Amino acid sequence: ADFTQGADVSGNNVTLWFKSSVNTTWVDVHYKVNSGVQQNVRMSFNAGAARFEHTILTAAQAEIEYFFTYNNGVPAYDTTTFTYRTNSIYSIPASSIPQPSEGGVSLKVMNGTGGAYTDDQIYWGVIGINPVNGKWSYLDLAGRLLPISSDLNNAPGHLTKDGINYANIYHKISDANWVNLPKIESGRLFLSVGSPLYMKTFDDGFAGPDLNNPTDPNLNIIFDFVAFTVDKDGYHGNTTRVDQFGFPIQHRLVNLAGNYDRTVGELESETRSGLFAKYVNEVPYEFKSLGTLQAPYRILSPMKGPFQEGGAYENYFAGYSSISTQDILLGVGEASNPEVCAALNRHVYTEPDNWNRVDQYYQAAPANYYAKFWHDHSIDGLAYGFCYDDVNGQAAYLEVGDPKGLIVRVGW
């Protein structure tokens, strides 16, 4: 008659839930709040979560004693009495992932902020190219890629900030448990806390946040994103700190055959405030302001800071190679070759025998210590700290040919 049960807390409310693994079509919950009149409620079935739920208002502060009556076939059964009063990305059972449709992947955006934000305060949006017709599109909750356009910015329901209209392509975590992510080219899953992002869409693309612009509408918004392509060869995706860090993210990919289940991202035990505080202590002086200039919204990548052309540290790599600091940090020009770029960022360039020896990376200056930071505080030391961190398999990148589920957790 097995079941799992629990009490989800959100704001001042407590949602009792009952998930049956048997032949159950109805569930009554019987509860007492600080020993009051016994409430007996026929619970509602939440299809997305595949569980019965009943929300008790303004009771998060209270003591709740509850048990359930449920059927298993014809007869009814009672559970024992439970009492109120993990959230880990690993706690989502693979068995609970719904089968994706049309060669897609089931996507869950999960709230891991430990009470910092509620589900209805975390926003997400998927934008990318639909390979069906090559049209730039956004994902709806039905799993459909809808074409974006300039008109979308002004369509009914559009967003507005300081008198300017922006496409409303975003959803709240509270809007869905799972969404089908169909095949998509250069997709991005934008994530933001407190508000959506404000990004102009066009008939042939969109303009994202410009962290070099003092008046960018997203400068004072805490956001991040995951990148993915879903094609005939399956799911391929990553988190990235190549441009900025907004908040901890974990990215778990699970396959159909049941032999692939991998997760990359910041360690779940790292806190956002922890990371800002450690960043300014751990990195050498030249990299410190990357963590302060646009605090508390983000930590900046070096080329968005004083390592840029004309900046105070525009010659940070000067003695080490003849190749410019800017070429190195962005993997362009004389550092367009991935292995060269990688070795320079890691300070192993002058020792070819060490290019693929992880324990020798970042052992002397000058080096990309911003990139090093993300490796030090990420699962399995994997991170996209700079553009070519995938050299020697060091990036927070995952792929599988038969994807079932992708879980993306917003940490804090």
Ligand X SMILES: OC[C@H]1O[C@@H](O[C@@H]2[C@@H](O)[C@H](O[C@@H]3[C@@H](O)[C@H](O[C@@H]4[C@@H](O)[C@H](O)O[C@H](CO)[C@H]4O)O[C@H](CO)[C@H]3O)O[C@H](CO)[C@H]2O)[C@H](O)[C@@H](O)[C@@H]1O
Ligand Y SMILES: OC[C@H]1O[C@@H](O[C@@H]2[C@@H](O)[C@H](O[C@@H]3[C@@H](O)[C@H](O[C@@H]4[C@@H](O)[C@H](O[C@@H]5[C@@H](O)[C@H](O)O[C@H](CO)[C@H]5O)O[C@H](CO)[C@H]4O)O[C@H](CO)[C@H]3O)O[C@H](CO)[C@H]2O)[C@H](O)[C@@H](O)[C@@H]1O
Binding site residues, ligand Y, CB under 6 A: 185-188, 227-229, 240, 242-243, 330-332, 387
Closer to ligand X by CB, 183 or 377: give it.
183
Least Cβ distance, residue 223 to ligand Y (angstroms): 12
- Cross-strand partners of 136: 129
Asked whether position 186 contacts ligand X by CB under 6 A, the answer is: yes
Are 338 and 331 within 8 A, CB to CB? yes
Hey, which residues between 145 and 164 contact ligand X (CB under 6 A)? none
Residue 343 touches which member of ligand Y, ligand X, none, C-beta under 5-8 Å by kind: none
Least Cβ distance, residue 85 to ligand Y (angstroms): 41
To which H or E segment does residue 39 belong? Answer: strand 39-42
Closer to ligand Y by CB, 97 or 226: give it.
226
The dihedral of CA 22, 28, 32, 33: what is its sign?
A: positive
The rounded distance, in Å, linking the Cα atoms of 238 and 240 is 6
Least Cβ distance, residue 326 to ligand X (angstroms): 11
Number of helices (H), then strands (E), belonging to the chain: the values are: 4, 28
The rounded distance, in Å, linking the Cα atoms of 325 and 412 is 33
Residue 238 touches which member of ligand X, ligand Y, none, C-beta under 5-8 Å by kind: ligand X
Closer to ligand X by CB, 59 or 242: give it.
242
Place of tokens 């049956």: 20
Least Cβ distance, residue 183 to ligand X (angstroms): 10
Report in angstroms the alpha-carbon separations of 376 from 270, 280, 282. Answer: 11, 14, 10
Least Cβ distance, residue 325 to ligand X (angstroms): 14
Asked whether position 374 contacts ligand X by CB under 6 A, the answer is: no
Asked whether position 337 contacts ligand X by CB under 6 A, the answer is: no
Place of tokens 């302001």: 289
Whether the ω angle into residue 366 lies within 30 degrees of 0, i.e. cis, is yes
Hey, which residues between 375 and 394 contact ligand X (CB under 6 A)? 384, 387
Asked whether position 240 contacts ligand X by CB under 6 A, the answer is: yes
Measured torsion, CA atoms of residues 300, 302, 303, 307, in degrees rounded to the nearest 10: 130
Residue among 32, 161, 236, 288 that touches ligand X (CB under 6 A): 236
Kindly state the number of chain residues that form the binding site for ligand X, as judged by CB under 6 A.
16
Ranges of H-type helices in 228-324: 272-282
Residue among 332, 350, 363, 365 that touches ligand X (CB under 6 A): 332
Place of tokens 């961190």: 389
Give the number of other Cβ atoms within 10 Å of residue 53's Cβ: 17
- For residue 178, the SS3 value is coil
Least Cβ distance, residue 305 to ligand Y (angstroms): 14
Closer to ligand Y by CB, 187 or 411: give it.
187
Asked whether position 227 contacts ligand X by CB under 6 A, the answer is: yes
Least Cβ distance, residue 387 to ligand Y (angstroms): 4
Which spans of this chain sit near ligand X (rule: CB under 6 A)?
186, 227-229, 231, 233, 236-238, 240, 242, 330-332, 384, 387
